[PDB]
Design a protein around this ligand. Sequence first.
Ligand SMILES: [Cl-]
Ligand SMILES: [Cl-]
Ligand SMILES: [Cl-]
Length: 259
Amino acid sequence: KIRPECFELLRVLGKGGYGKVFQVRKVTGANTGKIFAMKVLKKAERNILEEVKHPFIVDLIYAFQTKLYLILEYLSGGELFMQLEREGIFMEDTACFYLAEISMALGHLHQKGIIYRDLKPENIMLNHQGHVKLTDFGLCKEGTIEYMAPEILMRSGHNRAVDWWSLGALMYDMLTGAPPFTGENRKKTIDKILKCKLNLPPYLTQEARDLLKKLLKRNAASRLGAGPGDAGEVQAHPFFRHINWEELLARKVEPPFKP
Ligand SMILES: [Cl-]
Ligand SMILES: [Cl-]
Ligand SMILES: [Cl-]
């Protein structure tokens, strides 16, 4: 009832790992004239996206094969950090808004049993009105013990905590203009991530600095958000004290930038 020829290619939005994503116009049906995105590929993205339904996650509309086509809503707001590029750095209020929306989306995903694992600033799209939209999938997952390493007993690298670190790295980038650990090189970079000490600029509020320290904690078990409260642990932090979560979820909070 639906096929590749039901859509008109308008342009490539990008070529992410795996397949391409085109802007398309739907040429038949009742939604004729309507603009979507269409991802093309030669736990899986379709399943996850079928499942999840959040104000702050890109919606799925159609899916079908040849090889695989996913029709998603088209996001006009573009990349969030292209906004950071221009501002150089966000202020705590502005950063707070986006981090909060992103926190709700992660929290939802986590409840749905899914972790991002590789949430980066490219993944943060904005919709026509400037609200967050979480977007790419594919790199995403899900006797005695007295002598067993902690990382095993908690499924390190494989639990919700990995995403709260990322939210942390991303807060850091928003507030300072750069990620927390970076080197001249890829190796020198991962090595700073693994072992290096966090350096916070002195001009951060105490609330922001405290949150950053709790999110960017190497001990995954003690990291804010790692507990069963998940996003709740994070949203309760004083940094987010001026957030009305019901209004935020209603997208009735005004985004600080309107594309
Ligand atoms: Cl977990
Ligand atoms: Cl500080
Ligand atoms: Cl206050």
